[PDB]
């Protein structure tokens, strides 16, 4: 029961929703079409529930991984940007919004982990993971640590695990092969082994989580952390002199973070699809549209080339895009939930010492292929 002749947009409360509303007011001034931006609690849960009825927002904003499940249930309309429009956004961002061969959302922002370092403690941060043990030794003697980051969540630990050849599902032929999982190959074992040795050798603590690591870095206790652009404003409040840079290499190969793409999908039940396309292509995805949003709450890096080129004068943004391009788009397929469970479990079990790396990743291989259709 979506009302015709208006646009209702759903976006999360930590985004620049007042900025997006200003873009909505500009749209209303030109078209006479009222745009209402809302930020309800747990909208990512509400949307699939409410959209199944055939009601809810015309446009929904969320990370692209979640939109695959939405498109599986047929809740998202196929978008129709012409060739000219597609050329305005970075090619890899379009790969992130493709599901069953069709485009199902407009890319808005690009997020990826980077190495965040304290310039005062470490003006020349390490280029390799291999030099961190020696660096920690030096820093401990001065009363600090080298590196603290969230070890509890595989999103944060995966970039090292994937570096020397680990992967989630083989991508080729425009398709993910869910029977070909790369969590238990030589590369994944090498990466996880290095991570566990860091703990064995007292350079990291197995129990370090998001909150502990963030507090420590922002208080000047540790020289480095690994985090995304969402974390920068807390560091800004802390008065630590920090930089953001390329992740360290492992065995001469780049760390490979998963790339998240904030995307705007169109409700398949919306009777305002043409209105939504005009809004998204010609109002939001312009320098002026993204600026309005960015001014309210920063987007980090963006998919729109023209505006990204302005933002990338900030080296933290340049770093984010660099790491993103060395990483991999996060797969959007249902089986990713099994993969995430698998890697989470394996890292905790290996890091705790109750399983060896080989034992833990053997179970990860099995778990990744578990038949999650209940």
């Amino acid at each position: 029961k979506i009302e015709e002749g208006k646009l209702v947009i759903w976006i999360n409360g930590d985004k620049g929703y007042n900025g997006l509303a200003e873009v909505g007011k500009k749209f209303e001034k030109d078209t006479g079409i009222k745009v209402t931006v809302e930020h309800p609690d747990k909208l990512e849960e509400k949307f699939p529930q409410v959209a199944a009825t055939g009601d809810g927002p015309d446009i929904i904003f969320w990370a692209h991984d979640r939109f695959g499940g939405y498109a599986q249930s047929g809740l998202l309309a196929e978008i129709t940007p012409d060739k000219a429009f597609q050329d305005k956004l970075y090619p890899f961002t379009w790969d992130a919004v493709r599901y069953n061969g069709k485009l199902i959302a407009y890319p808005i922002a690009v997020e990826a982990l980077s190495l965040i370092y304290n310039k005062d403690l470490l003006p020349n941060p390490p280029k390799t993971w291999e030099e961190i043990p020696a660096l920690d030794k030096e820093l401990k003697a001065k009363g600090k640590s080298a590196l603290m980051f969230n070890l509890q969540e595989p999103y944060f630990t995966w970039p090292l695990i994937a570096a020397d050849g680990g992967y989630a599902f083989k991508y080729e032929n425009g398709k993910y092969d869910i029977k070909d999982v790369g969590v238990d190959n030589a590369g994944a074992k090498a990466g996880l082994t290095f991570l566990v040795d860091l703990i064995k050798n007292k350079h990291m603590n197995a129990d370090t989580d998001y909150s502990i690591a963030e507090a420590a870095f922002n208080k000047g206790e540790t020289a480095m952390t690994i985090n995304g652009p969402w974390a920068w404003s807390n560091i800004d409040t802390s008065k630590v002199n920090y930089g953001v840079t390329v992740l360290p290499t492992f065995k001469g190969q780049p760390s490979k973070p998963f790339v998240g793409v904030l995307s705007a999908g169109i409700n398949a039940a919306s009777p305002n699809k043409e209105l939504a396309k005009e809004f998204l292509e010609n109002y939001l995805l312009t320098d002026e549209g993204l600026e309005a949003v960015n001014k309210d709450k920063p987007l980090g890096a963006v998919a729109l080339k023209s505006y990204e080129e302005e933002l990338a004068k900030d080296p933290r943004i340049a770093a984010t895009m660099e790491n993103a391009q060395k990483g991999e788009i996060m797969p959007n397929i249902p089986q990713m939930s099994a993969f995430w469970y698998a890697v989470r479990t394996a890292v905790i079990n290996a890091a705790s010492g109750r399983q060896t790396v080989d034992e833990a990743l053997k179970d990860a291989q099995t778990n990744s292929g578990s038949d999650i259709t209940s």
Binding site: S337, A338, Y341, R354, S370, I372, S374
Partner: protein, 250 residues
């Protein structure tokens, strides 16, 4: 039922997370969690509790169970489905015809036990898997079932005849509990496992009743149809006794 026991299950070190397809299995483990005849006798896997887990479509219910093959290097696995029928009062009429066929063409009707799948890890090769579908043509007599059970005890080099007494002792314990006729169990199994690297110093073998998705708690609910469970256990024991005698010449 159609629902293979390990399908959708997760491994977490010494635990498995087993998805709840209905409440019957969960309710059974909760019902016996304080009963010594079940929990102190080593005849079912240890139960640790119910847990909710999100897998990208909403929270699913799982029960946390003992992983019977924890740290097994070369696993050997045999699943035998127990009972004289594998349907119950809740079985869909659309699925009834097939159950009736398979129950009679397999050894289910005649023995109350049938072959349900096997895995053998026979050195450094990929595992050899033996499908449940063998039961309706290749393992459809007492003699062939006995031969396939002997193959389970064949580690690739020798028959592990020293393990057979353990399996008989386990069946005896199951018989003693099931004599009380407090439950009806349809399509449940006895799982046989060992690690071929097992030694006297590191014992790695197990025999457990599993898969209680069609268990009826007779004190709480009526079920008039017979399961033939005790009949199945007795026939399985008889086969193991025959194997023990046949292995004496080794």
């Amino acid at each position: 039922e159609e629902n293979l026991y390990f399908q959708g299950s997760f491994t977490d070190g010494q635990y498995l997370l087993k998805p709840c397809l209905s409440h019957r299995e969960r309710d059974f483990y909760l019902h016996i969690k304080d009963d010594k005849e079940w929990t102190g006798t080593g005849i079912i896997p240890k139960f640790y509790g119910v847990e909710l887990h999100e897998f990208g479509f909403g929270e699913l219910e799982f029960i946390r169970m003992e992983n019977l093959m924890y740290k097994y290097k070369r696993p050997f696995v045999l699943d035998l489905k127990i009972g004289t029928q594998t349907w119950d009062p809740e079985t869909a009429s659309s699925k009834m015809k097939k159950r009736l066929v398979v129950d009679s063409t397999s050894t289910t009707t005649s023995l109350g036990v049938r072959f349900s799948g096997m895995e053998r890890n026979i050195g450094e090769e990929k595992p050899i898997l033996y499908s449940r579908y063998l039961c309706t043509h290749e393992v459809n007599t007492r003699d062939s079932l006995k031969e396939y059970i002997k193959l389970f005890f064949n580690d690739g080099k020798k028959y592990r005849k020293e393990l057979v007494p353990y399996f008989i002792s386990q069946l005896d314990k199951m018989i003693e509990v099931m004599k009380k006729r407090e439950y009806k169990m349809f399509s449940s199994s006895v799982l046989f496992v060992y690690d071929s690297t097992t030694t006297l110093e590191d014992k790695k073998y197990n025999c457990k009743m599993i898969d209680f998705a069609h268990n009826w708690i007779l004190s709480e609910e009526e079920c008039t149809v017979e399961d033939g469970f005790l009949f199945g256990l007795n026939n399985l024991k008889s086969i193991l006794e025959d194997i023990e005698n046949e292995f004496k010449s080794l």
